[PDB]
Write a protein that binds this ligand. Structure first.
Ligand SMILES: CCCCCCCCCCCCCCCCCC(=O)OC[C@H](COP(=O)([O-])OCC(O)COP(=O)([O-])OC[C@@H](COC(=O)CCCCCCCCCCCCCCCCC)OC(=O)CCCCCCCCCCCCCCCCC)OC(=O)CCCCCCCCCCCCCCCCC
Ligand SMILES: CCCCCCCCCCCCCCCCCC(=O)OC[C@H](COP(=O)(O)OCCN)OC(=O)CCCCCCCCCCCCCCCCC
Ligand SMILES: CCCCCCCCCCCCCCCCCC(=O)OC[C@H](COP(=O)(O)OCCN)OC(=O)CCCCCCCCCCCCCCCCC
Ligand SMILES: NC(=O)C1=CN([C@@H]2O[C@H](COP(=O)(O)OP(=O)(O)OC[C@H]3O[C@@H](n4cnc5c(N)ncnc54)[C@H](OP(=O)(O)O)[C@@H]3O)[C@@H](O)[C@H]2O)C=CC1
Ligand SMILES: *P(=O)(O)OCC(C)(C)[C@H](O)C(=O)NCCC(=O)NCCSC(=O)CCCCCCCCCCCCC
Ligand code: SF4
Ligand code: SF4
Ligand SMILES: [Zn+2]
Lengths: 49, 122, 77, 133, 118, 353, 427, 185, 49
């Protein structure tokens, strides 16, 4: 039962690398709606004035 | 000296009369300690060579006319004094302050133009 | 020649059978040297016993990053 | 080991083979022959032993060493594959550059690997040619 | 050095260097470190350049052919080779030869060719 | 000191003068590198970026020499003074070859003749076989081809064969050397039962191994030292008894001096050397060495010709004998009245622990 | 006008000793002669270390002793200071991640978790649910791994030697799971900004469940040897006692904070990853001593196991890596087939991803206390400043205040109750 | 030390119990002292281990388990043709966390983009595997070989002649580990 | 450095009790003759120490 089979005999072809529909689709996702790195918040600064 | 044997609370010189008083007390302790530094670290030099070399390290900063610069130079001394009087520095750190125990020796810059030219910048 | 060779083989047999290492576990590699003492890989079954003292030891295992502050104590040990 | 296990394996391998194993492995162990390395090492398997002890090797040399195992068998002995090199197609690739014999770890011997620079010196110097006078 | 053939010949398959900045083994394995040494134990891989040119040409009826290195995701990034010059076109990543069937007559007439061509 | 060296054969070296990772570009072969002197010549070349070929007989002994150099700098070769191939292939790449090989006693495998002659022969013949540029032969003080001492005889004859076949040989005749891990001060420091037959009356000019190690570097760096003989020795005349009292004055050790006459000591000296497998410090030829005094060659160059000053042994005894100084709280002097009073401000017992 | 006004010393900096205030006289709680009371006692100093166990590899603590008791304890650290915080300024963010494996070298995937969470916060990205659960599962496998080192090495110093060997088989089994997801028994480099490097292999969640079914029995037998043992009890009761007020004032975190009766866990108070999705309890002690901190650590064994089982049952499907190739590397198959993917592959492994400007202090509940990092970003591809907050560094700083008056055999127990790996302390 | 808002329900401890308020019979309490019963239980647990199977592996005859993703010594691989896979992009040189890779490339005699130098300082390398994640042609890998202690550290400066020799030696096992892990890469 | 007084107490309490138990060993090899009268005296000696 334990570590049986080894990972070396796990069939390569069985595993699937997934995509999620919004971000991995071909037809209804412009990248610029999902570019949250470039919509980063700025630091909001308030001085004594 | 509450936490350690030679600890001194970090203090800021109030004026030049105070700052010169501290420098002289720092120099006094160091040259007092030179026999104790020469046995622990087995320095193969006379106590006189140690004392004359301690003097050089104060003679470097004799022309400092800034009071904020003296306090950092005093704190550096006090900390160096603490790690030498407690056997914390290794003989290798201490007798590496003497700049003649390099296999090239004290003579490590070229003396003049021509001797450094014939040796390729020393 | 045989006789001196036998003296060597016996001497080498005991330098091999009792293999006592002094150790400087400086960092993580020491963890992996501790797993050499655990049940899966046991050193005792081959005769290895880590001794604290250098006087009782045969081999030094420098296992870990050596720093300038640690080096004088490495050479002393 | 334990008496029930060591007794049964004597009933299998015989007293001359029992002493062979005490000299090398230090255990009395019985299993099926799985194949032979090019270096001559022999591999055995027994699903009925303690975990991580189902596969072992009987080395061909007296001064054995873990670097005597040929590479594809090395994956089998390490439980990294379940198919031994005796049925693995990846070993049946023809590679004339591939080594013919198994070379082990060759340090501590006069055949130890010696590195060298593989590139030419950077700056070529003038080959002095004095013009005639 | 010098006496063994392995210390003298750049690779087992090839005797000469194959780039201008490659050090010959004769000069790389001279000096004191290579005394009291086994030169037949020294790492000496077969030269790839000789092996690649022993490769037969893939004849093709197409202008553009695709090479991925021959192992699916175990090859190189898939690229496209144009075979419209009367020469043998080679994959930039792996070196395999490709040639259009239109240049077979011309290619078979050359005296020396960079790939076996059959 | 210069960045360019044209070797005696004519090839140029372009050195970069720094430390371990630098380029000294000198290739050296030091024969006799595992003794007490060789570790100073090896370390001096290696720590400045030079390749040093170190032929060795025993694997364990040589190990301390590798620390001094960066990767590819200290190369070790397994050699035997009777295997010429090992000698040949140790010197084929070398620019300078050193020969420091020498015993003070005969063995079951080497007579002072075999070591100092049959080895110098076998080695210098290789130096001449490959046109090595500099060959430096370390001989002994008092070397003389016609001497009652086999050490002064056989080492004096090697000097002959060195220049018969290699006329451009530097000869170096050092005085008894002293310092760390020597057989001079450490002998007087360590032994307890000491045998002599000339009242410890040897007179000589003790020299520090460290200047000898530094001097051997400078014979490589000056092309003018090639082909002449040097006499390295210290600044003051000394007798062994005067040397011992210095050891005595530092360490406070009591030793037994037996001083058995020469007729009853020398025949006995051979026996002990023939049955004891370690260097017992007394042998037949070593006792004869006791009767001679060092005579300085007046036609031979000295430290000054190499820009060097020897140091005496008196300035160094405290340094090299300080490790051998048993000083506990017991041996301290009787206390004074002032400090006896200081003890009354402390409690010297913990009555609650 | 510093530094100009400081040249002549016209201003003095107001020190804390200026703002000292006398205690209120009313509600204030608690000489030379011929007698021996005025007499002074000499002390002698003692150089303690290095001990045999791996974790306390580079400790040179100098004690001053009055007889047997400790007067003042001065640890000298730095024997494993390797300049990590400087070398991190010359590396990209992905290149600097392996430096975090080597801080607390018994708790690797939680060191790289706090660096990933810090970088991910400046990236302004949300990592996928599967990597959230993978990280919370392997963060608790890590917590079990560290406690097996910390508890059993502590008892090996105290002189119990058998529980150490039993639980290092448990440690030996739990490092097989590290080597299956990554290829390292110690330094995985598995947790990375944007999720995890690779998906878990296809039979691992079954193998962790098989390990899970028996791990409680291992805690129970380890607990058979120490918990009720009077020798164990009489070597940890009353030892290394810190008050709740002082643990806060001393910068204590974790079980050092929690063993004095302060209920506080970063996982409960500032939830990260999938911790808000799992039910677990927080052991809080009473008497602030080593026995409480031993009992709190054993309870965490059972709580981490209870989280790992919950993570197995909520493991969702989907990417284990943030689905954006400007931040995380594309699959190998994409890079070998699609133009945009090879461009994003190439630039991530040479330049790295840019992090937007700003600074963040991020903390997690590491097994040795609170571990935090301060990262200044300059908007470029290399960190402008990385600062690691190590729980053990603050713990060793309070060793003098805690071991004062104790015996040296007591102080060895205090060293083990503080979870101390010196690569953590010196960064 | 407790959160703001109402204190936790029964956060405060009960008052301590006096010695005579404790619920433990003198017989039970005195017997456990003199008989040392809890120490007896722990000694019994060691008898239980005594009669259980050991965990030990006989190495080097039996090896421990290693995954297809294991990170051992480096190797340079070929194609089925025999050409080196490496085209000198230098990506593995850029990503090296410890600057352990030094690559010099130029145009080969046949015009192909190939390395002239390929050195890996095995004493600088941290065995992270980054070099093999960044490859676009699977040229650099880390074999499952962990058994190569050497005598001198000059033996740990792998040049391109040793790394290719390693790939020729280890190719079946390298191809096998790649075959297992490729879907996840 | 001052030495702790407890070292002295260990040797002293041993020295006296060890002398005391020594004085009882003759009783254990002379019990039958000593009988009740010897027991009473030894009980008195045991009681004092
Ligand atoms: C209270 C005391 C016990 C506390 C510990 C827990 C014991 C326990 O769990 O026992 C169950 C445990 C079940 O284990 P297992 O994994 O099912 O063993 C099955 C094997 O077939 C067992 O294979 P095996 O060959 O070991 O068994 C056959 C036989 C083989 O041994 C012999 O015939 C003689 C061995 C001893 C003489 C030579 C030296 O062993 C015995 O019958 C026991 C002999 C040794 C008893 C004394 C040992 C020293 C104390 O039984 C034992 O291993 C020993 C039984 C208890 C012995 C107590 C003494
Ligand atoms: C077992 C050992 C068997 C040895 C057989 C005799 C070998 C022999 O002749 O050795 C000679 C040796 C004298 O020592 P040798 O090595 O010549 O020189 C070193 C300084 N005396 O003298 C010996 O070592 C022989 C006596 C050995 C026992 C002492
Ligand atoms: C096989 C089994 C035996 C194997 C060896 C066992 C060795 C046990 C040694 C235990 C020593 C414990 C100790 O130091 O003292 C514990 C204690 C006496 O000290 P105390 O201050 O009264 O502590 C009260 C709470 N334990 O309590 C005691 O230990 C006292 C118990 C009485 C001892 C036996 C007397 C005859 C019954
Ligand atoms: N030191 C002194 O007081 C004086 C010494 N000298 C001479 O200077 C030289 C170096 O001095 P020092 O370092 O003290 O010498 P040591 O005796 O300490 O070392 C001599 C060296 O010669 C090697 N050697 C000796 N005999 C043989 C042999 N038969 N075959 C091969 N190798 C051999 C030794 O190797 P191994 O250890 O394996 O035997 C060792 O490396 C010697 O020639 C010495 O006689 C001259 C005058 C004074
Ligand atoms: P006189 O009135 O002529 O001079 C007095 C001074 C010097 C104060 C001048 O009047 C003055 O105002 N000078 C400027 C103030 C000044 O000197 N600043 C610096 C003072 S601190 C200092 O100089 C520290 C020096 C180094 C301390 C350590 C020295 C020994 C270390 C090595 C010892 C040997 C190895 C262990
Ligand atoms: S091994 Fe791969 S990453 Fe490294 S230079 Fe070659 S092709 Fe580029
Ligand atoms: S595994 Fe080693 S060689 Fe490869 S990138 Fe990492 S440090 Fe560099
Ligand atoms: Zn291709």
């Amino acid at each position: 039962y334990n570590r049986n089979p080894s990972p070396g005999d796990n069939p390569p072809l069985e595993y699937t690398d997934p995509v999620t529909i919004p971000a991995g689709d071909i037809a209804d996702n412009p990248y610029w709606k999902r570019d949250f790195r470039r919509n980063y918040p700025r630091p909001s600064v308030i001085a004594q004035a | 000296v509450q936490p350690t044997k030679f600890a001194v609370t970090v203090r800021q010189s109030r004026n030049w009369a105070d700052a010169k008083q501290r420098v002289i007390a720092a120099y006094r302790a160091w040259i007092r300690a030179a026999p104790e530094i020469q046995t622990m670290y087995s320095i193969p030099f006379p106590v006189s060579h140690i004392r004359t070399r301690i003097r050089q390290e104060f003679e470097r900063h004799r022309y400092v006319n800034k009071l904020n610069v003296v306090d950092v130079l005093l704190q550096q001394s006090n900390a160096d004094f603490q790690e030498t009087m407690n056997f914390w520095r290794q003989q290798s750190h201490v007798m590496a302050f003497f700049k003649e125990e390099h296999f090239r020796g004290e003579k490590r810059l070229p003396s003049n133009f021509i001797t450094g030219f014939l040796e390729g910048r020393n | 020649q045989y006789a001196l060779t036998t003296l060597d083989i016996i001497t080498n047999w005991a330098r091999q059978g009792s293999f006592w290492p002094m150790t400087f576990g400086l960092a993580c590699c020491a963890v992996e040297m501790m797993h050499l003492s655990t049940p899966r890989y046991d050193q005792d079954r081959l005769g290895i016993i880590f001794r604290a003292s250098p006087r009782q030891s045969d081999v030094m295992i420098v296992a870990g990053t050596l720093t300038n502050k640690m080096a004088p104590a490495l050479r002393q040990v | 080991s334990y008496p029930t296990r060591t007794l049964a394996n004597l009933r299998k391998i015989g007293l001359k083979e029992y002493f062979r194993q005490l000299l090398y492995i230090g255990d009395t162990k019985y299993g099926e022959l799985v194949g032979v390395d090019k270096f001559g090492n022999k591999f055995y398997e027994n699903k009925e032993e303690l975990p991580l002890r189902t596969r072992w090797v009987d080395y061909a040399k007296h001064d054995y060493d873990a670097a005597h195992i040929e590479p594809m068998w090395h994956a089998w002995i390490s439980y990294q594959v379940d198919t031994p090199p005796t049925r693995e197609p990846l070993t049946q690739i023809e590679r004339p550059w591939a080594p013919k014999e198994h070379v082990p770890n060759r340090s501590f011997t006069r055949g130890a690997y010696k590195p060298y620079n593989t590139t030419q010196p950077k700056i070529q110097s003038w080959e002095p040619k004095a013009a005639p006078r | 050095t010098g006496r063994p053939a392995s210390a003298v010949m750049q690779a087992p398959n090839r005797a000469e260097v194959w780039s201008r900045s490659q050090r010959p083994r004769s000069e790389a394995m001279a000096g004191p470190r290579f005394e009291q040494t086994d030169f037949d134990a020294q790492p000496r891989p077969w030269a790839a350049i000789e092996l690649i040119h022993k490769q037969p040409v893939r004849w093709t009826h197409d202008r553009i052919v695709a090479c991925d290195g021959g192992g699916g995701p175990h090859g190189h990034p898939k690229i496209y080779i144009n075979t419209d010059k009367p020469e043998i076109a080679t994959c930039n990543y792996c070196g395999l030869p490709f040639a259009n069937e239109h240049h077979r007559k011309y290619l078979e007439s050359l005296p020396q060719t960079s790939y076996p061509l059959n | 000191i210069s960045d360019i060296h044209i070797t005696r054969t004519g090839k140029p070296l372009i050195r970069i003068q720094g430390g371990r990772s630098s380029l000294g570009e000198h290739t050296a072969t030091v024969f006799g590198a595992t003794g007490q002197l060789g570790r100073y010549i090896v370390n001096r070349l290696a720590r400045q970026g030079c390749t040093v070929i170190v032929p060795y007989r025993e694997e364990m002994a040589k190990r301390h020499l590798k620390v001094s150099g960066d990767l590819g700098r200290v190369i070790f070769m397994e050699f035997d003074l009777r295997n010429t191939q090992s000698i040949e292939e140790s010197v084929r790449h070398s620019d300078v070859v050193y020969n420091l090989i020498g015993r003070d006693y005969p063995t079951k495998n080497f007579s002072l003749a075999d070591v100092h002659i049959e080895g110098t022969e076998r080695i210098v013949e290789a130096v001449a076989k490959y046109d090595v540029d500099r060959f430096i032969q370390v001989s002994t003080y008092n070397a003389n081809p016609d001497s009652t001492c086999e050490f002064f005889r056989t080492k004096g004859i090697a000097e002959k064969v060195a220049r018969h076949v290699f006329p451009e040989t530097t000869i170096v005749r050092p005085a008894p050397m002293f310092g760390f891990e020597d057989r001079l001060l450490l002998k007087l420091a360590s032994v307890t039962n000491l045998f002599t037959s000339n009242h410890m009356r040897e007179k000589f000019w003790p020299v520090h191994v460290n200047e000898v190690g530094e001097a051997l570097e400078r014979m490589l760096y000056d092309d003018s030292t090639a082909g002449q003989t040097f006499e390295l020795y210290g600044p003051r005349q000394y007798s062994m008894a005067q040397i011992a009292e210095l050891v005595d004055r530092e360490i406070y050790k009591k030793r037994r001096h037996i001083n058995l006459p020469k007729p009853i000591l020398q025949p006995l000296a051979e026996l002990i050397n023939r049955v004891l497998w370690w260097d017992t410090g007394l042998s037949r030829d070593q006792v004869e060495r006791e009767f001679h005094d060092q005579v300085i060659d007046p036609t031979a160059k000295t430290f000054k010709d190499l820009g060097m000053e020897p140091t005496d042994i008196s300035k160094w005894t405290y340094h090299y004998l300080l490790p051998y100084r048993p000083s506990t709280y017991y041996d301290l002097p009787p206390s004074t009245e002032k400090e006896m009073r200081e003890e009354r401000k402390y409690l010297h017992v913990l009555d609650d622990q | 006008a510093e530094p100009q006004d400081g040249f002549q010393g016209t201003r003095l900096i107001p020190t804390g000793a200026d703002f000292q205030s006398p205690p209120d006289p009313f509600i204030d709680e608690g000489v030379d002669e011929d007698s021996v009371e005025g007499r002074k006692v000499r002390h002698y100093t003692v150089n303690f270390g290095p001990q045999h166990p791996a974790a306390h590899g580079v400790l040179r603590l100098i004690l001053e002793l009055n007889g047997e008791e400790i007067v003042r304890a001065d640890p000298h650290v730095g024997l494993l200071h390797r300049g990590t915080e400087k070398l991190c300024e010359y590396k990209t963010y992905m290149q600097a991640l392996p430096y975090f494996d080597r801080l607390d070298y018994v708790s690797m995937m939680t060191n790289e978790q706090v660096f990933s969470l810090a970088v991910e916060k400046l990236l302004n990205i949300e990592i996928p649910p599967r990597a959230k659960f993978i990280r919370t599962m392997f963060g608790e496998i890590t917590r079990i791994l560290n406690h097996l080192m910390s508890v059993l090495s502590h008892a090996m110093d105290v002189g119990a030697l058998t529980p150490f060997l039993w639980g290092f088989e448990e440690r030996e089994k739990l490092m097989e799971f590290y080597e299956r997801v990554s290829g390292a028994r110690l330094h995985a480099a598995y947790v990375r900004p944007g999720g995890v490097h690779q998906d878990i292999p296809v039979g691992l969640l079954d193998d962790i469940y098989q390990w899970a079914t028996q791990f409680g029995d291992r805690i129970d037998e380890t607990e058979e040897m120490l918990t009720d043992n009077r020798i164990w009890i009489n070597r940890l009761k009353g030892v290394g006692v810190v008050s709740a007020a002082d643990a806060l004032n001393l910068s204590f975190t974790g079980v050092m904070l929690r063993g004095s009766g302060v209920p506080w866990d970063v996982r409960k108070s500032s939830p990260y990853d999938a911790y808000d999705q799992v039910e677990f309890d927080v052991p809080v002690g009473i008497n602030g001593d080593c026995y409480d901190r031993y009992l709190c650590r054993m309870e965490e064994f059972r709580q981490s196991l209870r989280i790992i089982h919950q993570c197995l049952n909520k493991m969702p499907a989907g990417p284990v890596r943030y689905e954006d190739y400007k931040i995380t590397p594309p699959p190998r198959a994409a890079m070998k087939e699609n133009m945009e993917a090879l461009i994003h592959h190439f630039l991530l492994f040479t330049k790295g991803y840019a992090v937007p400007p700003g600074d963040t202090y991020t903390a997690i509940e590491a097994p040795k206390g609170e571990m935090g990092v301060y990262v200044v970003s300059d908007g470029s591809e290399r960190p402008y400043r990385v600062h690691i907050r190590a729980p053990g560094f603050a713990h060793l700083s309070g060793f003098d205040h805690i071991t004062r008056g104790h015996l040296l055999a007591d102080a060895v127990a205090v060293i083990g109750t503080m979870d101390l790996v010196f690569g953590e302390v010196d960064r | 030390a407790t959160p703001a808002g109402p204190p936790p329900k029964n956060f405060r401890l009960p008052p301590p119990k006096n010695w005579d308020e404790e619920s433990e019979s003198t017989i039970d309490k005195v017997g456990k002292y003199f008989l040392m019963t809890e120490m007896l239980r722990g000694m019994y647990v060691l008898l239980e281990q005594f009669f259980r199977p050991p965990y030990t592996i006989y190495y080097p005859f039996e090896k421990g388990p290693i995954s297809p993703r294991f990170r051992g010594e480096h190797a340079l691989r070929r194609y089925p043709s025999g050409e080196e896979r490496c085209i000198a992009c230098k990506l593995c040189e850029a990503v090296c966390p410890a600057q352990a890779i030094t690559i010099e490339a130029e145009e080969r005699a046949d015009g192909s983009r190939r390395t002239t130098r390929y050195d890996i300082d095995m004493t600088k390398c941290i065995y992270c595997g980054f070099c093999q994640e960044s490859c676009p042609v699977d040229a650099i890998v880390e074999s499952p070989n962990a058994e190569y202690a050497t005598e001198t550290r000059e033996e740990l400066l792998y040049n391109k002649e040793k790394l290719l020799a390693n790939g020729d030696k280890w190719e079946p096992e390298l191809a096998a580990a790649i075959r297992a892990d490729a879907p996840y890469r | 450095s001052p030495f702790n007084i407890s070292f002295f107490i260990y040797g002293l309490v041993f020295l006296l009790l060890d002398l005391e138990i020594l004085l009882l060993y003759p009783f254990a090899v002379s019990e039958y003759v000593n009988s009740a009268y010897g027991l009473a005296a030894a009980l008195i000696f045991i009681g004092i120490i």
